[PDB]
Amino acid sequence: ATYKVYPWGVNDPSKGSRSTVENPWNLAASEFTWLSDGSNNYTTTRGNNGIAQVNPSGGSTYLNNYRPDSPSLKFEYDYSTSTTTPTTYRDASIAQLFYTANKYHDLLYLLGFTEQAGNFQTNNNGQGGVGNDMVILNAQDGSGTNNANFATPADGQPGRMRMCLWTYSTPQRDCSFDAGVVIHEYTHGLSNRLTGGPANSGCLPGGESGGMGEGWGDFMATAIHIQSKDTRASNKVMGDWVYNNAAGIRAYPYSTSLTTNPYTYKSVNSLSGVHAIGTYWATVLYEVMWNLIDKHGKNDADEPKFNNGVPTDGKYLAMKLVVDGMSLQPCNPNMVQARDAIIDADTALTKGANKCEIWKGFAKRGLGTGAKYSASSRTESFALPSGC
Numbered sequence: 001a002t003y004k005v006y007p008w009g010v011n012d013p014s015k016g017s018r019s020t021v022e023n024p025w026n027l028a029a030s031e032f033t034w035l036s037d038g039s040n041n042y043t044t045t046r047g048n049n050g051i052a053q054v055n056p057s058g059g060s061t062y063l064n065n066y067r068p069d070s071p072s073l074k075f076e077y078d079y080s081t082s083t084t085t086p087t088t089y090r091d092a093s094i095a096q097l098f099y100t101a102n103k104y105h106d107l108l109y110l111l112g113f114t115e116q117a118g119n120f121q122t123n124n125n126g127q128g129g130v131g132n133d134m135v136i137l138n139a140q141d142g143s144g145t146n147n148a149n150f151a152t153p154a155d156g157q158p159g160r161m162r163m164c165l166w167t168y169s170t171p172q173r174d175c176s177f178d179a180g181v182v183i184h185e186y187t188h189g190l191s192n193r194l195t196g197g198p199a200n201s202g203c204l205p206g207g208e209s210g211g212m213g214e215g216w217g218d219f220m221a222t223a224i225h226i227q228s229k230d231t232r233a234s235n236k237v238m239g240d241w242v243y244n245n246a247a248g249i250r251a252y253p254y255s256t257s258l259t260t261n262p263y264t265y266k267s268v269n270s271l272s273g274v275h276a277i278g279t280y281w282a283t284v285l286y287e288v289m290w291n292l293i294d295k296h297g298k299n300d301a302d303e304p305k306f307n308n309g310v311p312t313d314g315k316y317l318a319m320k321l322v323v324d325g326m327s328l329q330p331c332n333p334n335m336v337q338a339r340d341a342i343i344d345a346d347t348a349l350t351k352g353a354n355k356c357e358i359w360k361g362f363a364k365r366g367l368g369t370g371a372k373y374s375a376s377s378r379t380e381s382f383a384l385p386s387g388c
């Protein structure tokens with residue numbers, strides 16, 4: 001089986017070129033491949049982890065929406081950034097969306113988002129949790145433009161991703177091809193399933209918890225696209241291609257310079273809406289990640305190496321600690337509790353080997369030892385534990 005796609009690590013069409021990749025699944029995470037659920041084999045963008053289609057109606061059903069009928073298993077379709085009519089590259093759009101989401105399924109699986117952790121699969125093959133909940137992957141969704149979204153029911157009911165056309169450019173830009181946005185949306189399914197465990201999807205409804213909900217997706221997309229040359233001095237934005245602005249969709253770049261990005265926990269008292277709040281959260285995680293990378297290095301490959309169950313590099317270690325923290329934090333968590341869950345995740349995973357790297361990043365942006373949450377009147381702190 002082949003896919004002609006912008007491969008994993010190329011965020012969007014302005015940053016790379018398409019090529020044909022063969023059998024891109026990781027069999028540890030997709031034992032049936034992406035094209036089977038163990039009982040049925042498919043000749044389209046359908047299998048254990050997801051089903052992809054266009055949804056021009058904007059409706060809530062999916063099985064009978066259009067997807068390419070390709071018994072060749074060569075999911076190689078025409079695409080050009082000059083094309084004005086997005087339906088003429090719907091096959092490519094669907095295939096790219098299927099590719100990116102399945103790759104991310106596989107990576108998250110390796111970081112611990114398995115069947116027993118409440119992940120999204122039709123068949124869990126005796127490994128725990130509840131199946132029948134592959135992701136419904138809607139490309140060119142007619143419910144709107146200039147946005148994307150993800151609905152996460154409890155374990156056993158499929159997640160639903162809606163990817164829309166964006167119309168701040170001519171030609172319009174199809175966000176199926178903006179991997180970071182795909183990753184951001186899928187991460188809503190990750191954080192909603194893990195937080196409060198897989199049966200509770202009401203744990204990140206709004207306010208500060210919902211803000212972290214936005215931040216986690218931006219962080220995961222950012223971390224995945226860190227480049228060989230990058231250092232803590234690199235600044236990163238979100239969605240700059242599909243949105244057609246070099247600033248991306250958030251108010252500041254993800255940066256370790258407090259000049260480039262000034263947000264601290266106190267700033268959240270003045271921020272309005274979950275995306276603004278999440279911009280602060282993703283900046284804190286960015287700080288922590290660079291502390292871990294500066295300590296452990298970074299692995300530019302598409303999957304981590306593990307030493308005694310622990311990612312060997314700071315990039316995937318950061319991702320793993322963030323994922324693990326979601327399983328330890330309370331339902332409806334605030335950022336102080338989510339900080340503590342990440343520290344506790346490191347205690348469990350590494351016996352506390354990264355305590356001070358984590359605290360330094362949180363403290364630097366006001367989530368130090370003295371921080372206190374309030375919906376309107378948070379208290380910030382830049383103080384560190386004595387051990388640090």
Ligand SMILES: *[C@@H]1O[C@H](CO)[C@@H](O[C@@H]2O[C@H](CO)[C@@H](O)[C@H](O)[C@H]2NC(C)=O)[C@H](O)[C@H]1NC(C)=O
Pocket residue numbers: 031032033036040041
């Ligand atoms: C359904 O798809 C699976 C996965 O591609 C097929 O399993 C492969 O079978 C061949 C031999 O038939 C083996 O050499 C491969 O190692 C198998 N792959 C995996 C991942 O197990 C299976 O044959 C297909 N079923 C039908 C009826 O065509």
Ligand SMILES: [Ca+2]
Pocket residue numbers: 115118119120121129130131132133155156
């Ligand atoms: Ca499941």
Ligand SMILES: [Ca+2]
Pocket residue numbers: 191192193194195196197198199200201202203
């Ligand atoms: Ca949950």
Ligand SMILES: [Zn+2]
Pocket residue numbers: 184185188213214217
């Ligand atoms: Zn979001």
